[PDB]
Structures are given as structure tokens and as C-alpha cells.
Amino acid sequence: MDLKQQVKNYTMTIRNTRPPTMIKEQDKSEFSHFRALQVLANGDEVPYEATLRNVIHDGARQPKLPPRQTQKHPGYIRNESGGFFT
Amino acid sequence: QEESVYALIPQPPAMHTSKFGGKTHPAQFDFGQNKVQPHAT
């Protein structure tokens, strides 16, 4: 429609052509973590952060608003004729 | 990634002395003298 949206669409087309490979959007020390764990298994002396590994995902936006409960108490409201809601 | 939680955490001489061996002594050698003395020379 316009320059900005055409650049947007081209980038999105590239994103769709490429396989997302279910990626995790952050890569920490994989083999360093494995090596540190093997060092812990026998040598029994490894730094704590060396033992640690961290992995992140997208999760979602929308930062955990509390539930609406979608439903009252089944003593106040009745369906049309006497009858619970489901 | 392969669902291998069992594989997640890994949990697993004198050289020798030859018979010929020996320090060279000033004998059995025709190149040099055949004695050893404290302070001869």
C-alpha cells in the first residue's frame, strides 16, 4: 500500500520462506554447559554459572491478566427456566 | 531435544627398566684408560 508496508511485507515474506525451525530465539553455552556438567559428574568442582544453562522462548505478549471467571455463582443466575450455565 | 532426560546428565604405569641397563665404567672399553682413582692426576 505504501513504502513502509511494502518493506514490512517483504520482510514477512522472507520470514515465511525461511523455516522457523521452532527456534528458541536465544542460544546460551550449549557445549560449555554439557562440559561443565561432565566436570561436575566426576571432578566435583564447577562454577555455578558454568553449570547453569538458560533457554528462553517467545511465550506470548499479553502479560498474564487474571482470569475473568466467565461465570457467576450457580445460585444467582439461571438459564431461561431454571437451570445451570455451562 | 531428543527426549533423552536419561542422557541429560552424564553420569559415568611404571615405564620399565631394561636388562642391558648400566652405567658406563672405564673398563670393557678400548677407547680409554682402565682405572678409576680419587685424585691421581
XYZ file of N, CA and C in Angstrom, chain A residues 24 34 37-38 41-42, chain B residues 1 8-12:
36
model
N 14.365 -21.020 19.465
C 14.210 -20.568 20.829
C 14.657 -19.127 21.027
N 27.288 -28.587 28.768
C 27.490 -30.033 28.777
C 28.842 -30.398 29.381
N 28.827 -29.830 33.155
C 28.105 -30.899 33.837
C 28.934 -32.175 33.912
N 29.647 -32.512 32.836
C 30.529 -33.673 32.900
C 31.664 -33.456 33.894
N 30.195 -34.179 37.225
C 29.882 -35.584 37.466
C 31.036 -36.311 38.147
N 32.277 -35.968 37.793
C 33.442 -36.644 38.354
C 34.340 -35.704 39.147
N 17.097 -32.427 23.092
C 15.884 -32.251 22.300
C 15.210 -33.584 22.005
N 20.454 -36.527 29.703
C 20.619 -35.126 30.078
C 21.919 -34.922 30.845
N 22.063 -35.618 31.963
C 23.237 -35.510 32.821
C 24.118 -36.732 32.571
N 25.364 -36.555 32.142
C 26.262 -37.708 32.007
C 26.744 -38.162 33.376
N 26.568 -39.449 33.658
C 26.998 -39.982 34.943
C 27.943 -41.175 34.809
N 28.998 -41.109 33.974
C 29.907 -42.252 34.044
C 31.192 -41.926 34.803
